[PDB]
Each structure stands twice: as structure tokens, then as C-alpha cells.
Design a protein around this nucleic acid. Sequence first.
RNA 1: GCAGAGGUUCUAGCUACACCCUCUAUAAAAAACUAAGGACCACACGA
DNA 2: CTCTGAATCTCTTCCTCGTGTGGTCAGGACG
DNA 3: CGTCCGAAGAGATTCAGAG
Lengths: 1316, 623
Amino acid sequence: VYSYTEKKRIRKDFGKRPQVLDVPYLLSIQLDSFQKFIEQDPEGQYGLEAAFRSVFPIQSYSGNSELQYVSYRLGEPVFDVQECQIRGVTYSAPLRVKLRLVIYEREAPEGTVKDIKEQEVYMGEIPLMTDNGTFVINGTERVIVSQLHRSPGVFFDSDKGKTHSSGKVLYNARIIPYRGSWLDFEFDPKDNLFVRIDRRRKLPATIILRALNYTTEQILDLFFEKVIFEIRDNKLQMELVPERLRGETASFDIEANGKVYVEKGRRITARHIRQLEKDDVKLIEVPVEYIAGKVVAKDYIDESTGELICAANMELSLDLLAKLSQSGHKRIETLFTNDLDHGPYISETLRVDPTNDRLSALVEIYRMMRPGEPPTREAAESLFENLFFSEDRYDLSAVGRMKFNRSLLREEIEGSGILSKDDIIDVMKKLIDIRNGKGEVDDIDHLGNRRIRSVGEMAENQFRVGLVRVERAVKERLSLGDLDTLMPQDMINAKPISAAVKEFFGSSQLSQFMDQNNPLSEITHKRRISALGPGGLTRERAGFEVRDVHPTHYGRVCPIETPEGPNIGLINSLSVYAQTNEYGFLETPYRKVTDGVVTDEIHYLSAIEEGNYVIAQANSNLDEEGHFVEDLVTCRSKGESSLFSRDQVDYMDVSTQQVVSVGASLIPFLEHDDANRALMGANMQRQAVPTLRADKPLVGTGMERAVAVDSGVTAVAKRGGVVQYVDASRIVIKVNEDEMYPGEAGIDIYNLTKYTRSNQNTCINQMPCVSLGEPVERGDVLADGPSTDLGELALGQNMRVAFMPWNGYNFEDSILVSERVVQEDRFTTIHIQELACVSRDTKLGPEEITADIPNVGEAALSKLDESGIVYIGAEVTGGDILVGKVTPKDSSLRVPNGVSGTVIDVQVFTRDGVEKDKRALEIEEMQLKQAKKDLSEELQILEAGLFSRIRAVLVAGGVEAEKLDKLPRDRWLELGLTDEEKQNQLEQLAEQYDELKHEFEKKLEAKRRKITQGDDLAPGVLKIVKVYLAVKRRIQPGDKMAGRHGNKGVISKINPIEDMPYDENGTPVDIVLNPLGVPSRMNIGQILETHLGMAAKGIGDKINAMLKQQQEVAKLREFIQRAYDLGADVRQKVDLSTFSDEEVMRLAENLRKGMPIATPVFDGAKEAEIKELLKLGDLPTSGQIRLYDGRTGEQFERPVTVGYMYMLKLNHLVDDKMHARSTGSYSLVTQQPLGGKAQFGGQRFGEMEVWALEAYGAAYTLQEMLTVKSDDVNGRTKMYKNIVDGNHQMEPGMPESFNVLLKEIRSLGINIELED
Amino acid sequence: NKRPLKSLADMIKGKQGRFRQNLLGKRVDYSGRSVITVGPYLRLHQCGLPKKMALELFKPFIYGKLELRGLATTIKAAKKMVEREEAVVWDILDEVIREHPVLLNRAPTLHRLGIQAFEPVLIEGKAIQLHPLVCAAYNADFDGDQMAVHVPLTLEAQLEARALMMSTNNILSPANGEPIIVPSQDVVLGLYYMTRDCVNAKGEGMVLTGPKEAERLYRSGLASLHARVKVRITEYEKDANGELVAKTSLKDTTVGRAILWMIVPKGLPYSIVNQALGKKAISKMLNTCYRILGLKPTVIFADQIMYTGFAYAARSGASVGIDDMVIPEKKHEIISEAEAEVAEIQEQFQSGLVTAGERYNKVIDIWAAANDRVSKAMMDNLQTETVINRDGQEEKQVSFNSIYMMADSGARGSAAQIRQLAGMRGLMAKPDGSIIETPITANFREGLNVLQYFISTHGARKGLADTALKTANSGYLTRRLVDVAQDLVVTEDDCGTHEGIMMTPVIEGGDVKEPLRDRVLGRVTAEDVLKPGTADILVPRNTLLHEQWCDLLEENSVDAVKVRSVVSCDTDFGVCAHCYGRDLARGHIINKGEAIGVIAAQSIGEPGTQLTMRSSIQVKNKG
RNA sequence: GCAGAGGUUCUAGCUACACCCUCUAUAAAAAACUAAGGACCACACGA
DNA sequence: CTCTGAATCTCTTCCTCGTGTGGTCAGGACG
DNA sequence: CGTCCGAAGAGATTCAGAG
Ligand SMILES: [Mg+2]
């Protein structure tokens, strides 16, 4: 079965591998994340709830006052998305929050409250995301990109190599929290374990143990293994265990139980260990010289006086041995030191550490944290407990605790957010073990250590910041507050929380201005995964490691779609099938592999557990039983590609498109072109400008439909049915009876967005894709949005391309374009400009907007209306006047020079209080008329639908066809119908219609007030006039045109069609590319794409030939079936007999322009399949044909390659780039060019160009262009007067920038002057 | 915004400080930018330029001419006339662009030739047209590359731009004497296709009166472009004291090589156009033309050779296709042998005969051997497989395949860049640089496995990040090099210093990396060189070593030549001309004054972007 | 045409980069005409 | 016991130009 | 109506080993 719109033009899909999992909703990463944030979560986890619950204690200091959160509910947005975008206001929901204030009696903490005050308070103003997963901040559609940052937890880095400049590897452990203070435990080059908290001065890390209420004895009991020594008559008989002898040297002669085991100079072999274990030796005599090298563990005092004979952790000498022997210390505890692995590291720190008590440790920590002031014991204790033992000032998220327990190999998954003594000692023990050799350091770039912070998590963090900021003020106010003297609304204000949220959403390191020029651009910018951002590595601070792709990126982050330049690999996109785990990690679908069967069950796997199993390659053949036909299959066990037997395999890739993202998946033959060319092609697809009439690509991937549907550019059908009425501005869908709810179903109305200004000044145009009466199913495409054709993403426009040099006009990378392309408007793109005029307050009276402008001609004022605003639809040109504004004593807005076009609409916003001019009244009246017309249209349409609902029910059980036509349709409650459930349904519809009639005038009045009320504007402005200019930029020499395979070039010449190379058929090639760019830049995919497009157009031409002549539908059906079969078995498998025999004609007419072919990313068309496809048509199997010269007329030898490759048109048009300037306004430093942009500017003759002129014998052109052309005011004036005089003579003078430098150096206090 | 606020020292230091932002290099007026266009019809002394850009840049000149001719009484009326773009304004504009050079300027001006002068040719459009030859000098693409145009104002500025900065005056790069305007990518391919031969081509065998008859036969279509035919040529040589003598002979050649003969100037011999004429051959041709004919004949010859190369590359139709890249028939058996060998090595490791390290080394070695074998098989299939007759039984010739012609000619491509298309792509390394044990066996003509493409994108991301870091490192190095320099200019003409450095061809254990001919060329000796005959003044003490002297040195078999080094110069606050040597951009001694510190710094720093980041003694030959 | 004012237009026009005429304390026979301001930080993208 | 060399700590950049956007001391009421 | 609140190297700075 196929969808009806798919029946219109069904895409020939290659790919032998059968798909098991349908492509997920590409915008899930944003929509699902925000649905988690704004949702009311009863569990109070993950949402505005956790944020309120985490910060709602409100405990007064000795005031018995408490305020608690009870519930909240986001209000309905004041303005709809379209209304907020046109007004410039944010799309936000008022945050109705219900709060309960309770006051307890004094000195009665356990007593009940004396009064309860519950009320709903408006705090904050939280913006919402549209159905397309994008915010609207200030009239701009702004999207928040998900941030990939190092997850909270513990990571044992190395910093191997450069440190200490001796090859000695250091080891450090960072306790990175979600919010709080970092805690790094580093090693001194002399193997001393230091602590570095918040990257402050290095400190002996043993001080933190003392700060955690631990003495030396406890520290050595935790971090070292006690060895018991017994004083005996036989020279202090020593107790040794078998395990401690492994890896030891010949310390002495081991003789126990009157038997010798190991002699002098004999290594302790495992055989010796086994035989002494069989003998079970426990006590071994040791020479007194050996104990000198041991270190005491615990303190010892004599039993007579109790004085300190020997403290803990110092070397033992002969005098110490004599003192402990004479005292009578029978039991002696010593540390087990093994320089091989179990080396001493805490002991060295304790030698370095001069602190012996917890108070001294706290004092030193305070000194190293807050120096310059005398610390206090209470102050130090408070600082430490607020720094590590306090939830408010320090917290690890559930992901942080999970990572902590993963790295520490703990058992529990969850735990307290704050740390503890056990956590610190466990981290130190693991760091010590890493130093010893057991265990391995972790990789920061691993996706198991870098989670993804979505928009919901960022918004929750900013909300928590706002809540704590207002909590500080509430606590401060409540200290002196009085009970029962105020409403629970004065202490909390929406101002700071709203300011924080608005600042985050509008101006942030991550609040990216959405590049809304392509559906692919929107779909890949909302899925963008940036490492940069708040709480993230910066570009300069980012290492080479982070930029560079990790083996664990497979299936999680696309390794092909990254922005080249300053941030390469830092803003990498997310692969098509990857989804974010509930802890922020990146999962990946993976088919479970059973005993030998590749089972269809899809198990999402994170990066940490991917290594544990072995992953099979997607390009592994199966025998339809899940059995690899392939006894050894290539696999990815631990990030290493290696052949594995079938029985070894534990998991398989979900499909062949897993690794690539949506931006890189749409490139056909991605398996052929080079990775750099693939990267550039994926990047350039995001910046193609929509053509006027977008058309499907002849060769594609099959994800274009998925990208177009998933993105919000098109108008998908939420409910199926039939198209009752279709219009270029609206589409009405009559929902089917089996797809509509019993109540309030009616029919669906879709208001397609007409020509609207976009973020990159392009047209967001939606054209209907259906006619009247066309059946439509659920989730179907109805309107072809920008760069969309028949529900398929149509970025550019495919055309004939011949690969051959042509007189140098395609010299190295330039593109040659025929006159035929320009003639048929293939690349004419509508650009909507936003020329906004503002009337601010001015001294000595304000400025008017009337048409009275002095020192101007009547011709310029002819376009403007009587009130000084350009007539809608007027075709203005460069330098023309749009709206007449004169300042009090000629500041009217004018079209910028060069740009032209016709005004599409002029919207005016006027603040309340100032009377609106004639044009504003006319526009407001037309807006009211349009709103009333739309409301009446929906009134009549929904009334017709509801009557059809009623009439259909009234065909049985009291049917009166004649009686219905008699009485007017307004009243039907008097009709006689059986007292059954049908009568109840009619009564329900009648009551609903009555309530709707009551609400109709209310909402109409609300709309009238919305269009009447003065729109909020910036302070000190009268009214703002926005004029939208539609520029139709045709293709021109210099316009940057680029295909999908990384081949980019500027159009050199628009060559007349008569000069184009034509084949024997006479059809001239539309574009003549350069073959020389194929071998070096290995974009060989474009050659495969060219051949497949040639085959597709051959099929289309055969269909056209058998369609232009009146042929039987049987011939069309058999040819279409032959085309869709195409030899080698494919997943497509479309049968033409199941069609209705008249939609076959529609299909053939839709394939007249070319056969649509889908080439999946990594299992697309092979060379044999393409050759067979060429053989299907009249075209040769070689793919290249003889072409005759356009001018000479004789065929080119060595027949050239032609085909219809899908090449885009990037938005880097030459029209934008022209920046010529002679003289203009100057800067502060008096550098004349004034930072060239829209502002009329000269290009920075930078330091490199100055060096270049210095290398030449240039001292006059350089001098003129560094002095008289740039900043010398007298010099500039004299040069201008001289050139207009005709004498090109330079009056040198001196650059004013040097005078500025002299003044700045003098202002420092350094006299710098010149000698005369 | 919680950011450090700029102080009185933050605006005197750093990139954004007053020095490097407003004094060292400052924005200028009379400047415009646009994307660039090829426009092969131009000559390198001129460039295309849009009408709007010429109107805006030359506004003061247009105002002055309007005032002089009385079209507008006042600047104000003339400015209104320029806004109206009245037809009279365009005619005035054509007068101020007759001989007014403009300085084409690409943004990353790495070396001296980054900015060059051009006579603007008014074109309708909005894209600057840059001559194809100077694109290599500019390192400029046609992929959205934009370059600024600056208008010299004063007579001194325009005059020195014409005399020095013109592309006609910049033929040899300052880094080395080799030409910089050499046919680079497409014209070289056209010449290479032109100068070849089929062993059996249409119109092969008949004798031709001259190049005119060769053109007549080719254009009429009755003789193939490259067919081995004897032609009669009037080869001109200047073996006399500047006089050109004529030598007429029947040199066996092809039609295509005879076509180029009318392009080359008189002085050049025919032995330079009788080869396949790749990139290196054309570079040597242009260098010989510059060293023999001079500058103007070299410019005219370069323009004509560009024209013919483009025209006959268009006529060639040197396309690219799937059948143009051939898979070796032995590639499958080489892959099978490599798989068998790695299986044997793994089996040996499993038993324990070979541990991990030696197993890894063995696998890497055998995979490299298989890669070399498949590369050789690919080259044999790509240059030897071609079978074509000679009106007889059987013969084998050098291939005319599209990719082989586009790679062997040096037009664009290399050995690895052609291996990655038909042969095994090779062992591809991980981010850390350690080689993946199992290579990317599949090539680009065939598909790539998902893991194979993952390793490929590992390498590609490594290369892209390396380039991104390396361009910044090279820019910093260029800045340091320029600034340790820029006080060193040629202040004197000679110092009479006998000191110097003994120039000797460099040997690093292998063959001669650089012969003494190309190492001492253009430098003035310090003491008289002598041949095996003692007390022989083969070259006097203070004579510049031009091409003739170096050629004489090779045939006299000199070993070490003491030469005057700039280090040994005793001149204060500069160096003398003799101690420096040839300008490396003009065929004469360095001019007294020219700044050579900045030239040297730019020459050193320009290839920084092209750099990278990471027994027994046996006699070789008889002697 | 260098310090000011007036003139036929259109409040005001004396070279202000700036457009016509008069003279040194007085205002009109006269058509082409008029305006002299403007930073930093972040994001994305191109080479 | 006073310097020696050596580890430690602190400074100083770390390309070069474009083109679109958006955010920015924020005195505030009283004589 | 105005006015007063990572990384990479160099060099300075401790800092230390050995007679
Ligand atoms: Mg380029």
C-alpha cells in the first residue's frame, strides 16, 4: 500500500538492505525536551516542578514565616505565533503560579499555623516553542541549539607528555559538578598527591582529609594497608602474609618454621608463594636492618607516662626501634610500601603538609580561598559546609551521580547530590590505583562522558538561577517582614526571573539566530549539537582533541556535517537516528542479534555500553532469517573494525544511514565522494536559497520527503479526509467520518503562509499541492513550502550538466550557465527585505510622517500616498523614497542604492496616545476587514460542516428530507427525532453550537481590540513603519552556485543558448562544469549523480515521448513497471496493477519532467544498476555522449559526460557583495571607511597588504592609501578638491590615527612627542 | 554583559589595539569588493570590472572630467548626474579608465604578488573578472572568492602601480626565479592534449609545409589534432650577437605540436614544444622564454598560449566519467592475497609465535605491499592497457584516458589523488596518528563501507583541523618574519667584501637534492671560481651568476662556489646590491633601495599553509 | 567671493567640502540651485 | 652559607579579510 | 528645572645541593 500523495509521484528507491526502523521525528530532540520542561510533572522530576521544588523553603530567621509552592499552570499565550512575529513581541505564556503562605506562632515550631493564604501569583514570563520547535524572541524566529558539554562526574585525566618536561606521566582527577566548584586532585612531579580546587593554587591534598574530620591514623588506615609487627624473644618475630610477597625482591633470607624458602639474591617466584601457602606460613623472621626502611602507621605512647614516644608517618631508625622495644609496644603497625605498584603517595604529602588538626586545615583552606583577611573557625567551617556539604551552593545532577558511581565502580545508581567523605576517599583511592597501574584513565572526547544539554535543561537551569536570585531577596525581606501585614505577592516579582529568562533566550552564547532559508537548514540547525556555550569549552580554549572526531561518534554525532573555519568539529550535527538519553547522553538504535538471528527489536545503546557488546555493520547481508550469509562479518567491538563470526555478534546497525545526519544524508552517492567534499556539500546544502518554482531532484536519497514532512515548512494534514476547497492562501480539509471525534470535530482548515520575510531575507511561500476532491490521509503533505515539491525537499533545481572545459569560462572551479537557465527562471529567487522606519522623540518638537518633504521632486513623491507612505504594490527602484519623514528644524526612509523590487505590504505600528495618520487608519481598517472576512469564512465553513454532520445523522430514525428544506437552517431543535442516543448527540451539538455562538462575538471583539490597541514599542518613539520589499534576484555572473557533492563555483558568463554544446538530438546543455575538479577534490559522487540523473531524464524523455503521442495506458504501465523493477532486487517493489489505471496517467504526467530516483547514503545505486538504467532508455550504457560545439558546430572528440545533476544556488549572491566606495562618513579614529557593510565602507587594507606594498617598491601608493585616502582630514579634503580639479597631487599631512595613538599613550602617563 | 571593559592599555596592544587595527593596516577609501570571474578573453595586463564599481570608485575623477568638459557647472550637479547614471556619464567614465590601474587585492595577501595592478576593462555585471593566469599567483579560486579593488589616485601612485604592480611586471615570484603566471590547471590540460600523438590517427604521415598548414588541416577536420606528421618550420635562434638566425628543417612531430609553433616567439627553439608539455614542461618553457626573449615577448607568448590552451581544451572535450577510471583486474587477487596473509599472521599470533607488536608490524607491512601492488596494477591499467593499431597488427601506446591525461600532465592531481579513485585508498590513520590495522580497501569508483567512510572522515577531520591550526600558525610566523625584517633594504651597490659562504650542493645521504646550478643562480660570487685547471678565472670575482654562467658551471663540472652572502655584508642599516644578488622577480641585479626583508619574510611565510605538522654504507654509482 | 547682510524661490542661504551678483554699514532688476553626524560584544556564514 | 641549576609561577599571544543577524552603566527622586 | 548620589614558550622568582 502507498499513500495517495506518494501515488502522485512515487520515488524509485534503491538499496538492497531492508529498513527495520522508520526514521524518527527529526525535531524530537527539541520538542520532546521542551515538553519535559513545561509539562506539569507530578513526580516533581525534570521540569519547572523540580525547579520550583528545589527552591521553595522560604524559612524566615526567627520569624516563623514559611511560603511553599503548591501548583502552577502556564497561561494561554497573549499573542499567537504569527501575531507575535509581526508585532515583534515574544511568543510567551504567562506563568500563573499558585502559592501558599502560612505563618506559625512565635516559639511554637511544632504548632499549627494561624492563617492560610492561597493565591495565584504571576511570576516570570516563559517563552514557548512553536510546532516547529523554535522560539520567537523579538519578531525573530530564534532556536536554541543543544549543547554537548562534559557531563558532571569524576574524570581521571593524564596530561601525558609535556608536563615536567621529562617524560614522567602525571595523573589528575576532577570532581566536575553540574553546579558548584571543581575539585582537582593532581600529582606533584615528585609523586605527591596535591589538591587544586577551582583551579586555585596547588595545595597538599591530605589537608582535605583533615578538613573532613580525619586524623593521620585514620588517613593511613584508609589509604594504606596496615602490617602488624610483634616483638618476640627471637628478635621481633615478623608477621608476613603470602599475598604481600608477590612481585617483591630478595629483601632478606626467608626462613620460617625451621625451613628455608627464599635465600639472598633470589626472586620470589609464584611457585615459592604456592609452596609457602601450602606450608601456610604466617610469621617470618626478618633482619633488624629491614625495619629501618618501614614507616610507622599509628601513634604509640608508653603505658607508664603516656608521652609521645613516636608519632605517626615517619621513618624508623635504630633509636626509634630501641625506644619502642624498651617501652613494650608489642604490636607495631607499619605501612605496606611497594615501589613497583603500591607506592607511597599520601605519606609524602603528609611530610609536605604542615597541618595536623581539622581547624588548621580549615584555616588554610580559607586562606587559599579568601586571602587577605583573618579567617575564623566558625567562618571556615561555614565556608566548607556551604562549599561541599550544602545543596544550594553545590549539587550534582542525577547524571552526575550516575557518572560518579560508574567511574568509581559503585553499585547504587542514584545518590545524594552533594559529596561526602566516602566519595572523596573513593576518588583518591581510584586515583592512587590509576597511578599504581591497575585501571585505566578515561577519554574526555568519549560520548559516554559528554552529555547533551537540550533547550529544556538550559531553560530549567536559567529558571533555577532566577528562582535563587528572587529567593535571596525574599529571605532578605522576610527577615524584617511582619506577619499578616502583606499579600504573598510583594516579596516575589516577575522582573528578575523574567529578565534572566529573556536574557538567556535572546542574547546568549547559544541562543542561535535560526538560519531559516531552507527546510534542510531549519531541520539541521534545530538538531545542531554545539560544544561551545555557557559551561562549555570556547573556540580558543578548545583542544585539538575535542574538535577531532572520536570512534564512538558512530551513530550518535555525524562525522561529516561540521562547519569548517574557526569552529571545526565543535558544532557537529546529530546523526539521523540518534536520540538523547534521559540522562542527556546520546543513544543509537541497534538491532538485537539473537543466537544467529538479527532480531527486529531495536535497543537504543549509549556510548559507554556500546563497547561492551559488538556491533555488526549495516552492510552485512542477511538471508531473511536474520542469519548472516557471511560467516565472518565486519564488526565494531571496541571502536575497532574487525571481522567476527556470526555467533559472536551481539548487535547490528539499524540501517545504513545511521552515521550521517540529515544534512549529509540527502547527498546522493555519499559513499563515493570524498569526506571533505561531502562535508562541504552538506554545509552548502544548509545555505541554498529557494528557487521560485522548486522541483524534485532527479537523483536523491529518499530522506527528502522525511526532512520536508518533519520540518515545519510544509502544511502536513493532522487528520485525513478530502479537500473540500483549496486556495492559494487556504486549504480546507473535510475530515472523514471514521477519523473525526464525536464532538467538536468539524473539518480542518489550513491557512498556508503566503510570501513572508524570512530570517535570511527569503520568501517562505507555501503553495497548495492538492486539487478539489483529492482524498488526503492522515499525516500527509498538503502545501509545498519553501524549497519543497510534492512533499519532497527540493533545495535547488536540477538541470543538464556537461563535464568539459569550455574556452576557460569554467577555468578551475567556475560554473558556466546557459541563457536557457536564465530564460526559464530556474534560479530566480524572491528576497523579502525589511526596511523599517522609526519616528523617535526629538528635541524642539517631534518629527512628522506626512508627505511634506522639502527639496525633493514631485516624481519621488508620486509613489507615496497622500500621507507619505508608499502605495502597496508599487515597484520602487534603487534610491527611491518609501515613507516620508522630516525632522524638525529630510530624514525620510529611502531604498538603498542598487536594490530594487516591489512592496508587498506596509505594516504600521503606532503607540497609544498619538493620533494615527491616514495610511495607518486605512491599514487598520483593511486589517479589521480581513479579520472579519476570515472569521465569517470559518463561520460559514464550520457551520456547513456541522450541518453535514447533523444531516448525515438525521438520515435514519426520523428522517425528513422535505421538512429540512422548508424551515430555515438556523433552527433545528424543533424537529421530531427518536428519543435515543442520536437525540442526545444532537442536543450536545446544539448546546455546543449555542456556546460557540456566544463566544464568536467575544473573540471577534478581542481580535478587534488586538488590532486597535497601540503596540508596545521602545521608549521615546512615536510610530514605527515597516515596509517589506520583494526583490526578485535572477541568476547573474558571480552568483555562487554549488551542487550537493561539494562542487562550488561562481557563474562566469551567461552564455547564449546558441553557443551551448548540443548533442545529436540538438538539446543544449544547461551548465558546462569543469572535469578538473573531480579527481583532485574527490567528489566522484557528482559523476555518479550525473550519470544517474542522465538515466532518470532518459526515462522521463521516453515517458514524454510515449505521452505526447496518444498511446494506450498499457504501454505506459508496462514501461513504468519495467523502470521500477530494474534488474537487481530492491526494497522498493512497487506493482502497477494495483493502481486505478487513471492515476497511472497522473503518475506518468508527474514523471514527464524526469524519473525520480532515490540513492540511499551507503547502499545506493551500483555501477551495474546505473548501466542497466542507461540501457533501459536510448542513452548509451557508457554515460557520456558526443557533443557538438555551439560555435564551431563540429563534434568534440572524446565524447563528454552529460547528465542532469541536482545543483543548488547558494545565498551568497554577487548582488550582496558589491561594496564600491569613493568617499563617505568616517569613524571615531577618523578612519574613513567606517567598518564597511550596509554602512558605506572601504575594505580594510590590512597589515598583510601593507607588507605586500612594502615588498614592492611602493612608497607613494602605500603612503597615499595609509594617509590621504584613509584618515588625514585635511589630506582627504585636499585630495578630493585636487582630483575634482584634475591635478592628482597628494598633500601628505599626517594620519589622525597616529595623533589618537599619541593622545592615548600620553593619557597613560607616558610623554610621547615629536621633535621639530 | 559581565566582560572586562577596555582600558587605556587594551586599546594600544593586541589585534584590536590602535597599532595593528588603525596604524599598521587601516581601512581605505576608493575600495570595493565582489566575487571574481574568469573572463579568459582578458590579457593579464588588464582585468574586468563592473560598471557600478567603476562609477562608484572613480566618482571624484568623473566629477573632475564633468567640470572640465562643462557638462555640469558644479560638483553638486555632477553628483546628481552620477546618481542618474546618464549616458554621458558612462562615456566620461570610459575616459578615466583608459590608463588608470587598479590594485586587485585578495584578502589573505600572503606574499608580494597577492596585490597586483590591472587596467580595468569596463564590463556589465557585478563580478570582478580576474585573468586566469594570475589566479595561481593570487592563490585565488572561483568558488565565491572575493578580492578588493583599490584605486591609485595620484600620478605617482598610478605610475608606480603601472611600472611595478602590473601582472606584466610580475612574472617571476619573489620566492624563486620560477614563473608565477605559468599555465596552471585547464590551459595546461589543453596543451597536454594538444602535444601528444596516436600511433594511428587521421591524417598521419603526410608532410606539412608549416604550422599554417597544420592549422588548416586540423580546422578542416581531415587530419587529427595529434598525428605524427613531418612539418617544415622556420626555427629562429639568437646564437649571433643578438641577431636571430633562421634554421629550416623537417622535424618529425605531430600536428598539435606544430599548432603551438606559431604561438611561441621567434627566439624559442622547437625542442621545447616537441614533448608532451605537462605543467613542468610549460614552466620550463616560460622560464626559457623569459630568460631569452625578455619580458614583453614573454607576456605576449603567455597570453597566446593561454588562448590556445583554453580553445583546444574546449575542442578536446576532456571529460570525466566512470569508464574513465579503470579497476585493475588484479585488484581482486591482490585483495585476496592480502586477506590470506593477514589471516595467516593472525593464526600465527593466536598460537603465540608472534606477539601483538610484531603482528601489527607485519600486517601493516603486508597491507602496504598490497597497496603498492594495486597502485602499480592501476597505473598499468591506466597507461598501458590502451591497445591501438598502426594500420598493421598490434601496438601499445601511452593512454589517452581522461583521468590519466588530467593527472600525468600535472594539470590537477597527484599520485595519491589518483590512487584514491581506482586503487585501494590505503591504510587510513586514527586521530592520534596510529594506523588502522585494516585499510580502506574499497576505492571511490566503487562504494565505501560505513566503517571505511568512518575512517575516511577521521582522516578528513584531522586534515581540516590541521589546516585550520596551520593557517593561524603560518600567519603568526609570517608576522614574526616580517617584523624581524622591514628594517633591511638595499642601501648600497657594493661593499668590496671578500667574505661570503661557500655554496655547495646539499647532500643528506641520498642523491643531490638541489644542484649547485639552481642553488647559486642569481648570486654574486666572492672569489674567482676555477675549473680543474688551476689559476683559471672561469668566473670573475664580482659577476652575477645568470643562466649563462650557471650553464657554463655545469659543463665545467664545478663542485663548490664561494658566493657573497647577505650575512657577510658589512653595510650598516642595510645591505649592498651585490651581496644580495638577483631580484628573483626581474632578470637583473637587485635595485638599489628595494625592500628585501619584507620580500624574504613573505616568501618564507607564504608556504607555511602548505607545510605539515607531524648499519652499512653502500655506494650508489661508479666514482 | 573668505570678516556681514541683501536679492528674484521656499524658514534660512555669509564658500560651511559646498552654487550666482553687490558694498563696507545701504537691500533689489535676475534664470540653473541647497543640508556638512553615527561605537563594542556575541552568533552564524564565505573564502 | 651563598650561590648553581632547576622547578615553579606568571606573562603573552595563538591568521586575515569580508557578509548577514542579535545584545549592551542599568540616576531617580528631591531641593 | 537642575543636581547628587588548552598550549607553548620565555622570563622572572623562588629555591635549593654541595662543597
Ligand atoms: Mg576558492
